[PDB]
Design a protein around this motif. Structure first.
Motif, mmCIF file in Angstrom:
data_model
loop_
_atom_site.group_PDB
_atom_site.id
_atom_site.type_symbol
_atom_site.label_atom_id
_atom_site.label_comp_id
_atom_site.label_asym_id
_atom_site.label_seq_id
_atom_site.Cartn_x
_atom_site.Cartn_y
_atom_site.Cartn_z
ATOM 1 N N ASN A 7 0.903 -1.421 0.073
ATOM 2 C CA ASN A 7 0.179 0.011 -0.100
ATOM 3 C C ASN A 7 0.889 1.329 -0.105
ATOM 4 O O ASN A 7 0.454 2.293 -0.474
ATOM 5 N N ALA A 8 2.044 1.249 0.437
ATOM 6 C CA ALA A 8 2.847 2.327 0.365
ATOM 7 C C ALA A 8 3.341 2.734 -1.106
ATOM 8 O O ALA A 8 3.061 3.991 -1.755
ATOM 9 N N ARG A 9 3.764 1.622 -1.824
ATOM 10 C CA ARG A 9 4.034 1.796 -3.393
ATOM 11 C C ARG A 9 2.371 2.104 -4.094
ATOM 12 O O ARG A 9 2.553 2.729 -5.003
ATOM 13 N N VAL A 10 1.436 1.639 -3.405
ATOM 14 C CA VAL A 10 0.144 2.016 -4.103
ATOM 15 C C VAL A 10 -0.292 3.472 -3.925
ATOM 16 O O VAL A 10 -0.730 4.208 -4.888
ATOM 17 N N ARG A 11 0.099 3.970 -2.805
ATOM 18 C CA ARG A 11 0.043 5.429 -2.456
ATOM 19 C C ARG A 11 1.006 6.245 -3.341
ATOM 20 O O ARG A 11 0.653 7.359 -3.966
ATOM 21 N N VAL A 12 2.086 5.778 -3.616
ATOM 22 C CA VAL A 12 2.985 6.361 -4.532
ATOM 23 C C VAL A 12 2.593 6.460 -5.893
ATOM 24 O O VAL A 12 2.755 7.338 -6.619
ATOM 25 N N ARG A 13 1.945 5.238 -6.298
ATOM 26 C CA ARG A 13 1.197 5.223 -7.539
ATOM 27 C C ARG A 13 0.176 6.229 -7.812
ATOM 28 O O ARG A 13 -0.338 6.703 -8.890
ATOM 29 N N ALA F 33 -6.503 5.975 10.925
ATOM 30 C CA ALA F 33 -7.765 6.459 10.148
ATOM 31 C C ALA F 33 -7.710 7.807 10.265
ATOM 32 O O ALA F 33 -8.128 8.385 9.118
ATOM 33 N N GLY F 34 -7.020 8.492 11.109
ATOM 34 C CA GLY F 34 -6.939 10.021 11.067
ATOM 35 C C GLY F 34 -6.054 10.549 10.072
ATOM 36 O O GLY F 34 -6.174 11.390 9.307
ATOM 37 N N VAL F 35 -4.898 9.664 9.961
ATOM 38 C CA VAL F 35 -4.002 10.204 8.748
ATOM 39 C C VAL F 35 -4.506 9.707 7.517
ATOM 40 O O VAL F 35 -4.305 10.375 6.382
ATOM 41 N N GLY F 36 -5.242 8.764 7.272
ATOM 42 C CA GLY F 36 -6.045 8.429 6.115
ATOM 43 C C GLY F 36 -6.978 9.371 5.724
ATOM 44 O O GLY F 36 -7.158 9.718 4.598
ATOM 45 N N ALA F 37 -7.755 9.931 6.634
ATOM 46 C CA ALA F 37 -8.720 10.943 6.402
ATOM 47 C C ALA F 37 -7.993 12.392 5.998
ATOM 48 O O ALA F 37 -8.506 13.042 5.200
ATOM 49 N N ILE F 38 -6.938 12.707 6.700
ATOM 50 C CA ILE F 38 -6.087 13.703 6.194
ATOM 51 C C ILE F 38 -5.506 13.702 4.965
ATOM 52 O O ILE F 38 -5.618 14.831 4.143
ATOM 53 N N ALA F 39 -4.977 12.589 4.590
ATOM 54 C CA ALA F 39 -4.600 12.197 3.281
ATOM 55 C C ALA F 39 -5.484 12.295 2.156
ATOM 56 O O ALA F 39 -5.246 12.853 0.896
ATOM 57 N N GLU F 40 -6.627 12.004 2.734
ATOM 58 C CA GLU F 40 -7.903 12.044 1.739
ATOM 59 C C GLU F 40 -8.320 13.487 1.364
ATOM 60 O O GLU F 40 -8.537 14.073 0.527
ATOM 61 N N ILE H 14 3.597 10.111 3.650
ATOM 62 C CA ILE H 14 4.902 10.827 3.384
ATOM 63 C C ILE H 14 5.282 10.297 1.798
ATOM 64 O O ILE H 14 5.648 11.122 1.073
ATOM 65 N N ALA H 15 4.877 9.041 1.571
ATOM 66 C CA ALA H 15 5.433 8.173 0.509
ATOM 67 C C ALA H 15 4.143 8.710 -0.580
ATOM 68 O O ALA H 15 4.565 8.501 -1.959
ATOM 69 N N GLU H 16 2.971 8.948 -0.152
ATOM 70 C CA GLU H 16 1.953 9.626 -1.184
ATOM 71 C C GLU H 16 2.474 10.821 -1.673
ATOM 72 O O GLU H 16 2.594 11.084 -2.965
ATOM 73 N N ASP H 17 2.761 11.776 -0.878
ATOM 74 C CA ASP H 17 3.141 12.941 -1.179
ATOM 75 C C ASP H 17 3.974 13.838 0.026
ATOM 76 O O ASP H 17 3.853 13.503 1.174
ATOM 77 N N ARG H 18 4.912 14.519 -0.439
ATOM 78 C CA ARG H 18 5.623 15.522 0.508
ATOM 79 C C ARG H 18 5.215 16.927 0.694
ATOM 80 O O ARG H 18 6.022 17.752 0.443
#
Lengths: 320, 649, 73, 74, 73, 73, 49, 49, 49, 49, 49, 49
Positions: A7-13, F33-40, H14-18
């Protein structure tokens, strides 16, 4: 197993994709501006030359690079869960192999798109007089399609009614596997997809007067066999009966194109709710469906710039 | 009890059966039956009648959608007897007016929402560009971008011409309208370069992004000045149209639903080639009104009220509750579960027989009983207002009859609750710290209490014994009703199973009280041997391998009755501890914080009561449904539903 | 009392605590599958509560042994 | 009147109440998770969901009963 | 209290600690599903708030047992 | 003091430690879940912060019981 | 710990089909032999007591 | 136990976006008040011993 | 604990292919060094007393 | 704990087919060496006591 | 606990390809350092005995 | 407990790429600091004993 390591590489993608503003910029192009915009995209990593065929091969190679690795980088129950995501092209290749075994066409007759396993399995299953032996050669440990082929294998050898019953049993085994895992959101998305597929095949085979119990599968939540029979009958009231469910906009429509576009939009809105599960796999399925919609929109822009199609003809596609 | 639901056969003409169907829908007290295949047609009456029914159904759907667009709800009332063309003429005018007003209001709201964002920015761009808008030299791409990273966009302008490609933001400090003006074609290439750097020009909708920017800002200010008055006038017109036409639309939709139900019921008929057959099921308590309606035929066209089937094999035939008015209020909680097999026992009297007596032993707080009396007075005032029980918080819309049955159940529960709370001798936790009205042997101040409920050296054992006695009596009642229903349905398997379960439970309780309980295990040794032999004999006469798990499940269902005493003692201990802490920190702390400490203790006690008494009252009915229903089966075929003709009114 | 009464009370308390832990452990997945079937169908509640309350027999037997200990106390 | 068995009885009642609340929370985790999932699915089945949520309190009630028995027989 | 008070305090501490452990064990999955529903929409925030507040009864019972041990210290 | 104050400190320490254990056990899924919602969405900071800080009452009650034990020690 | 997964799979199979109610009940009740053996050990202990 | 899932979600963000790494690090450092209360309790116990 | 997931993956590989049974059995029996060291520590404890 | 995942993977492979039923039984019985070692340690401890 | 996931992922990599058996064995043998440290501490304790 | 997930992700990366050995080995060897602190406290205790 690990629903976070992939899921880390999935979020990167998910961070690396083309937005809908790139498609709105592709709304006015003549395949050269569109080819330059796609050359900057990830399909530009596979864009060999020019033309609709090179662009389609580039989109297919980009999809196989993005989602074919999802079959790798995992082992065990989460591997089986991700295997129960991209079951479209694999079942299409299996049905093509069954049609080649029941038709008489050559082994090179199929174009053989990327399924879920290696193509050497399909090459060995080309020379396969035994369909149970062909399923055993195609038997991966987490492949439920081989299990469905073995379950429906004690009916005939190679029949088209056997193929339709095996497709229904494959949908049923996919629903049973979705119920048999610790992922209620993926099970709900699969159940919504199964109910929409039952409604789609029923509306396509509407007016045939055939046995709806032979057509309706088990596992649907928004519709029942009575709702399926009322929808298969000449009445959109059952389609008007879908109130509160994910078929919210689906009301009072009897067509196939607009109903399928609304079903695709409802499935895209359901997969768009998959951002809530960070530590599961719903973000991966959401990214897979988003990449599917984006590549379909890119191929649509390619064909529109090829044949000079109207933007008003493609305006019903830009909403999703 | 399960009613007769006796059958009704009828023969008429086609139109005479239409008249009799209108009568039996006006006298809507009989569920229908198709019975098409038995030597008759399917009553596909007329495609013209099907088209008229489709037109009336479309009129009813349009009336529902017109109430929805007007904001009205499906409120049932008396019908409006009128023609279908007259109904369409009455409906379609107000429906078209409301649809046009709703479309105009939605368009005006969308125009106001679109004008709320780009009013100042387009006006500022047109003010800076007061002479450079549409003269055929150079385009001016204004891009609504972020804060002062203007050099990151101006890198492409520096890549463009020197004393031109003016790419800057003069105003609109919130969203910086970075106007870039170079050329037409060279500025188009520079706009592509800025989009490569990341940019988006203000391509607005409507006439804003389709006209010159001066006329765009002029039409923006015009729509901004026109949107509020037009939206208020549209809201006032929609409210006036709804308030003027909602009653007419409701009566029209009521008559349309009546006629559509008549059409859908006549679809389920059986026609006999200028004759017609009719088959229904109606209870015995309405046979007189049914005979009076059947006398109102053409010449009482030939019908008959025949009997329903017996306890054996009445599957499509429905049943009814048919309880007395002293016990009618528990029918809603009874109907929360499934239905009986028309010969299966109606255990609905056990709810009002046992749930309030258990809840009063649970809730022994007379202050909680007074709060329940005040809440019952509030619900009685709400039912006297006769409004729908409408809570937008819970999104709950309940009927006034449901609220009246709940108020009657609350009064009947509060009677036994006050009875067992005075038997508990406790009020609002403990006012006995100040006014010890329930006399204790340790603290003799006033008249005594039966159980002090803070003592457990004898009261807890007696409470456990009384709860276990009530639970074992209920379990024996369930097994006896199971054996009685097996005997009445001629099912000796169910009767032998109930007899063996009762014998095993009796032998188990006897062996428990002999070996682990008191002494004198001689008179009950033959009793435990007889219970074991009865269980083995019913197992041999059954041969179904109903193993020790069923006996252990029956034993657990019997032993679950001590949870009621546990919950009552836990709520009493919590309320006594809260009242003791309040009395200590109020009176024992100087007796000056009596009011403030009493208020804080009352707030905490109200919060604890709201947190606990819901589950405490829920567990009695849950244990009752888990014990008495499952001991009597109650999960076999779920019954058949009584659904007569509506005449919804 | 003495010393054996407190040790027997400690053992009865540990018995009741671990029995309630096992009961809640069973009831977690039991109620998970039950609420899944309830969201699937409203017609399955007649056996859902039965399958849920099927695990309370261990708590009942632990309460019986604790009452036997309190009688021994 | 032993000054050691009373503390041991208090420790036993405390361990009973604590592990009873532990098992109750262990059941209530999945219970409230499935209930909130059904509530996000539909705002029409709150009653049976709250019933299944409140069904696990019987173990805590029995633990409090045994703790009150230990407090009385101190 | 030299021998009874310290042991009673140890038992009340084990009670409050295991009760808070079970309360957080409930609140993990409870708040996970509630935050998923909050990320879905904000219309049903009250039902999720009530579901989160439902876990407070065990902590209230543990604090009551601790207050009983303090009153019997 | 001696064994009384020592076992009282042991009980207060076990209470505070397992209270922090339960608070962290809830806060794992809460912060995930909070970091997932903040990234959402970045517009979901306040409600998620409230849902994350709601589990501190168990550690607050453990600290209050430990302060009551220290007042008793 | 056994009955968690046992009753979960049994309720899933019962939601699939109610015809296997007895087989799923037997699969759920198969784990109670451990509780029966622990009760027998506690009975031998109380007899020694 | 908190920091496991917290750091997993934070490293995934962080790996999603910086771009929101500061709020992610703030949410990561938020699991410290329990250790602060434990350190205060240990200091009070050292002062009481 | 070491045997559980390793043998589950080995049984999945045996369901995948029966040709790597020797390598799967070697990877399964690799965790016996802990039992050998425990028996050695038990023999050392029996020799110490 | 070993036999949980071992019997789960073996039950999955058996539900596939009966092609490796004895091999799955041997892979499930592979964890009994620790039970035999604990039984021998208990025999040695009973000999000491 | 380490060797569970280590052997599971190593058997998965071996079912992927037999060429990476050596690196899988190296990653499996990487986790014995704490066991060696515990054996050394047990030897030091037996010397203290 | 750390090295379980560490070695699982490292063996997944090694099966993904043989060139990903160095940083994965660094991340796997990173989990020894707590064992080093425990061995330092054990050496302080053995010096105290």
């Amino acid at each position: 197993d690990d629903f976070a390591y992939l899921n880390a590489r999935v979020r990167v993608r998910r961070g690396t994709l083309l937005k809908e503003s790139f498609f709105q910029e592709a709304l006015d192009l003549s395949f050269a501006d569109f080819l330059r915009l796609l050359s900057e995209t990830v399909y530009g990593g596979e864009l060999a030359g020019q033309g609709l065929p090179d662009v389609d091969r580039a989109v297919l190679r980009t999809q196989a690079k993005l989602v074919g690795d999802l079959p790798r980088l995992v082992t065990g129950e989460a591997r089986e869960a991700v295997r129960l995501l991209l079951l479209r092209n694999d079942l299409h290749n299996l049905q093509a192999l069954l049609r080649a075994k029941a038709t008489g066409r050559p082994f090179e007759e199929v174009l053989l798109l990327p399924g879920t396993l290696r193509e050497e399995v399909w090459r060995q299953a080309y020379e396969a007089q035994d369909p149970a032996g062909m399923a055993q050669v195609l038997a991966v440990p987490g492949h439920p399609l081989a299990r469905a082929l073995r379950a429906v294998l004690r009916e005939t050898q190679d029949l088209a009614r056997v193929e339709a019953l095996l497709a229904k049993r494959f949908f049923e085994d996919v629903a049973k596997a979705a119920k048999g895992l610790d992922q209620p959101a993926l099970r709900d998305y699969l159940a919504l997809e199964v109910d929409a597929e039952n409604l789609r095949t029923a509306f396509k085979l509407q007016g045939s007067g055939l046995a709806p119990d032979a057509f309706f599968l088990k596992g649907g939540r928004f519709v029942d066999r009575v709702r399926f029979a009322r929808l298969m009958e000449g009445d959109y009231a059952v389609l008007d009966e879908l109130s509160g469910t994910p078929f919210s906009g689906l009301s009072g429509v009897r067509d196939l194109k607009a109903l399928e576009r609304g079903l695709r939009c409802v499935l895209l809105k359901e997969a768009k709710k998959g951002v809530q599960d960070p530590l599961g796999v719903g973000l991966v399925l959401a990214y897979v469906k988003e990449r599917e919609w984006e590549a379909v929109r890119l191929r649509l822009l390619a064909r529109r710039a090829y044949f000079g199609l109207p933007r008003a003809q493609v305006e019903e596609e830009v909403v999703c | 009890m399960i009613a007769p639901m006796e059958k009704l056969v009828l023969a008429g003409p086609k139109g005479r059966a239409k008249e009799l169907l209108q009568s039996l829908q006006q006298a809507g007290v009989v569920h229908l039956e198709t019975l098409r295949p038995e030597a008759l047609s399917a009553y596909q009456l007329s495609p013209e009648e099907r088209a008229e029914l489709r037109r009336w159904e479309a009129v009813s759907a349009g009336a529902e959608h017109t109430l929805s667009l007007l904001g009205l709800e499906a409120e049932p009332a008396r019908p409006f007897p009128e023609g279908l063309e007259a109904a369409e003429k009455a409906l379609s005018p107000i429906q078209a007016h409301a649809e046009g007003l709703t479309r105009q209001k939605q368009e005006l709201e969308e125009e106001l929402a679109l004008a709320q964002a780009y009013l100042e920015p387009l006006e500022r761009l047109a003010a800076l560009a007061h002479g450079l808008d549409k003269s055929p030299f150079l385009r001016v791409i204004p891009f609504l971008l972020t804060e002062k990273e203007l050099p990151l966009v101006e890198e492409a302008l520096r890549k463009a011409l020197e004393d031109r490609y003016l790419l800057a933001h003069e105003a609109y400090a919130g969203g910086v309208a970075a106007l870039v003006v170079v050329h037409r074609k060279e500025v188009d290439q520079a706009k592509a370069a800025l989009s490569r750097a990341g940019v988006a020009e203000l391509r607005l909708p409507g006439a804003l992004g389709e006209l010159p920017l001066s006329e765009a800002a002029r039409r923006l200010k015009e729509r901004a000045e026109a949107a509020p008055r037009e939206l208020s006038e549209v809201r006032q017109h929609l409210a006036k149209l709804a308030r003027e036409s909602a009653s007419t639309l409701q009566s029209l939709w009521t008559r349309a639903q009546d006629e559509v139900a008549r059409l859908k019921a006549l679809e389920e008929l059986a026609s006999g080639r200028f004759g017609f057959a009719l088959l229904g099921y109606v209870p015995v308590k309405a046979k007189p009104k049914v005979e009076e309606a059947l006398a109102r035929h053409k010449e009482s066209v030939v019908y008959a009220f025949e009997p329903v089937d017996e306890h054996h094999e009445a599957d499509r035939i429905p049943v009814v509750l048919d309880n007395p008015p002293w016990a009618k209020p528990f029918e809603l909680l009874v109907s929360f579960l499934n239905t009986p097999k028309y010969g299966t026992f109606d255990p609905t009297p056990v709810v009002p027989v046992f749930f309030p007596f258990w809840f009063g032993m649970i809730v022994g707080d007379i202050g909680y009983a007074l709060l329940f009396y005040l809440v019952g007075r509030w619900l009685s005032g709400y039912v006297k207002r006769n409004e729908p029980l409408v809570i937008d918080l819970f999104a709950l819309k309940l009927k006034p009859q449901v609220i009246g049955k709940l108020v009657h159940i609350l009064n009947w529960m509060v009677f036994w609750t006050v009875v067992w709370g005075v038997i508990y001798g406790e009020f609002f936790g403990t006012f006995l710290e100040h006014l010890g009205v329930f006399g204790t042997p340790e603290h003799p101040g006033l008249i005594p209490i039966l159980i002090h409920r803070i003592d457990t050296a004898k009261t807890a054992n007696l409470l456990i014994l009384l709860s276990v006695a009530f639970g074992v009596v209920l379990v024996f009642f369930g097994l006896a009703l199971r054996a009685y229903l097996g005997l009445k349905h001629r099912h000796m398997a169910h009767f032998w199973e109930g007899v063996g379960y009762l014998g095993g439970l009796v032998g188990v309780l006897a062996l428990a009280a002999s070996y682990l309980g008191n002494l004198q295990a001689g008179w009950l040794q033959g009793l435990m041997y007889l219970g074991f032999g009865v269980f083995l004999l019913a197992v041999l006469m059954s041969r179904i391998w109903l193993m020790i798990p069923e006996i252990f499940t029956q034993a657990g269902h019997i032993l679950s009755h001590i949870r009621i005493y546990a919950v009552g003692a836990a709520g009493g201990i919590l309320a006594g501890l809260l009242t003791d802490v309040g009395f200590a920190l109020a009176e024992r702390l100087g007796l000056l914080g009596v009011l403030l400490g009493l208020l804080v203790a009352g707030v905490l006690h109200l919060l604890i009561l709201l947190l606990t008494t819901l589950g405490h009252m829920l567990q009695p009915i849950r244990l009752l449904w888990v014990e008495f229903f499952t001991k009597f089966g109650f999960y076999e075929e779920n019954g058949r539903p009584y659904r007569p003709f509506k005449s919804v009114r | 009392g003495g010393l054996d009464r407190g040790l027997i009370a400690v053992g009865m308390g540990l018995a009741v605590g671990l029995a309630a832990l096992g009961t809640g452990v069973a009831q977690a997945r039991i109620g998970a599958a039950g609420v899944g079937a309830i969201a699937e169908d409203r017609s399955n509640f007649g056996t859902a509560l039965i399958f849920l309350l099927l695990p309370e027999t261990l708590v009942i037997f632990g309460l019986l042994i604790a009452f036997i200990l309190n009688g021994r106390l």
